[PDB]
Design a protein around this nucleic acid. Structure first.
Ligand code: NA
Lengths: 102, 94, 94
DNA sequence: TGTGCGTTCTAGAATATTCGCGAG
DNA sequence: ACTCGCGAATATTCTAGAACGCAC
């Protein structure tokens, strides 16, 4: 029913063993990826058939996720945050409302 | 969605800790940059991918700011102290 | 007249310091990137205003580079070891 | 028995940065 | 000769197109 990408992403974010690399934000309305390098090489191949952050990012955009911009990035002086309105901590059933672009 | 340049400009002008280098005018309808040299060298690279005052000014003109005729003053009709919601009306040129 | 990206890219690839992360292929008609995590974190910000491999890859495509399918290998016919003069022919997409 | 999903490589679109022109 | 808005090329970021394999 719910496509594999969303259930794995939900499980991956919620899993407390991965919270050093991917976890919910305190509000539970977005998720963070820390150290993209270790995440792509260590975490992604355990759920998907690849280890590329770009292929994970491409899927995020296919399901309508958007990157959250922090106002402190953009200067010359690793935290990647994504959000979807129906991807909320404690609301796994809401994943049926997220559906992929055709 | 309000572009990063205006949000950063609003934060930088409004911030009282930076007022020795960039701050609102007393009326709050314009802002001043003092000592452009130290501002470009020390403040800009903490917010933008450069330390060039010309590139900051170029963006000011891109968003329709104009210079009011060291001490450099710039103005935009929708860049007003206490009216942060008006940044939504500032649009980049075509 | 040669854009900064091509001169910097030729320089960083040719640099024997970085050959552990980015170097020419034996034939010298393509270049390899090993461990892009460390390449993006340490090499890119020394030449560009960022440390994202995606922003490096995007520029490679804007200049007509192509990824060769088999760590990470890219090629352009006018990007050859010892022929910095051929970069003159690599022209950026509109 | 066609359609939706996943992975990869490249391009689109908006804003950002640089350089130098020219009206006044 | 000089100031100050520009145009234009390139740079950076985030999202999408397109091709192909796979499943049901
Ligand atoms: Na200030």
């Amino acid at each position: 029913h719910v496509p594999a990408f969303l259930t794995k992403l939900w499980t991956l974010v919620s899993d407390p063993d991965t919270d050093a690399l991917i976890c919910w934000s305190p509000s539970g309305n977005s998720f963070h990826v820390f150290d993209q390098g270790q995440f792509a090489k260590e975490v992604l191949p355990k759920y998907f058939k690849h280890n590329n952050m770009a292929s994970f990012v491409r899927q995020l955009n296919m399901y309508g996720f958007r990157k959250v911009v922090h106002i402190e990035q953009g200067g010359l002086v690793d935290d990647t945050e994504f959000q979807h309105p129906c991807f909320l901590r404690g609301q796994e059933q809401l994943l049926e409302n997220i559906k992929r672009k055709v």
